[PDB]
């Protein structure tokens, strides 16, 4: 039993919780900065959450437990002067130039600087930013002129992936964040999943920009620029246009893309149906051959890097079907010329992804054929929003349009790919039809859905029982492997997503400030858009996609053999033995 006084208001409570959490639950404003994911920066507390506790003095609300008898003041002059001072000291290490900054519209530090009217003691104005910037990665970029040393990226990497690939380092006698030994992230165990970017309150961590690749292609007279968006983009991008959360903006995106000058509007959900054709065909082959097992998905490039970096002995069990991004891109340089008359060399294929790891996937050396890359550029959901705003397109006011259908139609199975368990559910819908040679009516697999970290299910296919698992976040992959769960039974098909929640929570998604994250379950709300589409779509199985059926009939032949196997697949292998 506890009685506490906050700003003169008495509260009676039995809760055991921090001052910050209690205050937020009771509509009392306390500021915070380094607190995120239930953790603050223990070795360098920001102290933005400072409050006064009578008899004790100034304390950090984000990590101090309420106790019976506490009398708390959150808004005294002494408290506010301390907070202002901490913000001023951060400005002393921050290049405060918001005009061209990519977080200008949604920066948590700027909000605090305005709120406390803080100013640097000395403006931080480095003349040469070269030593502060790291753009070596295909996926991530670091600008340490903006870094507050808040630790949010370090903590988020450990929580989300358990790789600890993001670290505090000593560089030239100064503390920075970066990769192991200050190497390029891509050359370390890093997954390039971008959860560190999602955790950053400022513009210090960003995606590696592909915006100039795209602009130059749009402006080249002879290039025919295809664009296709991932499942999750249509459930997410509206957030950056003050539209709120959970808004389906599929048709507005198609219109915006035409206004930006793209030459063909397709959809990666078509590629998702392609991946299902190959992946369900492979699963059925393995079922009819009673092996090999388990089969892992290979469509999340964060998981592919996790397997390469930590479980190379599993690479032979990964599916060889290309991911929807790469399988679509392969078809865009082969099938698409065959139905359009375009010279393949002049097609430039752009995807819009909720993902930074997809930029590494698209840039893998062997993701090409006959000199033509499968995918020429990958922009994130955030990059597309900036492109729209730079062009002055009034996004929230646009009318709906449709995709071009030849590589644009999608079934409901493809639409759900962006949520954890979506690939599994989509694959089972086709595998059961294929193996049983039937058109089954019961197609919903709710047991694989939702935010649990490890989700197992038993499925009956062709009068035998099989075991499936959906691994939801890279940290949960480690738990599943390290605890021996992989050996507790025979698994037959396993989905792995590196980002908890699936691609709707990817590393290229709009930032959400900590207060909105408490108010809204972003992973569930974004996913609900995708499940709503599947419910209302006429075709809810990938192999019922009419444009896809035409494409295989006229160009690829049978899935899993012949031309389809030759060009639509990509096999991972552990490295050849060498010493040292
Ligand atoms: S990170 Fe925030 S405060 Fe710093 S320059 Fe960019 S918008 Fe301004
Ligand atoms: S990209 Fe993912 S694995 Fe790499 S440092 Fe960031 S959070 Fe960690
Ligand atoms: S990169 Fe961003 S999240 Fe990481 S310590 Fe710097 S400001 Fe904080
Ligand atoms: S879960 Fe999706 S967004 Fe996250 S790394 Fe994998 S493909 Fe990228
Ligand atoms: S928010 Fe409490 S110490 Fe940083
Ligand atoms: Mg702490
Ligand atoms: Mg053009």
Author numbering: 1 to 580
Sentences from the paper on this structure:
Among them, [FeFe]‐hydrogenases exhibit the highest activity for both H2 production and oxidation. The amine base is connected to the protein surface through a conserved proton transfer pathway (PTP) for rapid H+ shuttling.
Two crystals of 1.39 Å and 1.5 Å, termed CpI‐CN−‐1 and CpI‐CN−‐2 in the following, were analyzed in depth. The refined occupancies indicate that the OCS is fully occupied by an extrinsic ligand in CN−‐treated CpI, whereas only 71 to 93 % of the OCS of CO‐treated crystals hold an extrinsic ligand. In the two structures CpI‐CN−‐1 and CpI‐CN−‐2, the distances between C299 and the amine group of the [2Fe]H subcluster are larger than those in Hox in both chains A and B. The side chain of E279 is slightly twisted and consequently closer to S319, whereas the distance between E279 and Wat1 increases in several cases. Wat1 and Wat2 are also shifted; in all cases, Wat1 lies about 0.6 to 1 Å closer to the surface. Consequently, the H‐bond length between C299 and Wat1 is longer than in the Hox state. The electron densities of E282 revealed varying conformations. In chain B of CpI‐CN−‐2, E282 is twisted towards the surface and out of H‐bond length to S319. The structural changes in PTP elements observed in our CN−‐treated crystals have been proposed to be necessary for efficient catalytic H+ transport, but they have never been observed structurally in wild type [FeFe]‐hydrogenases.
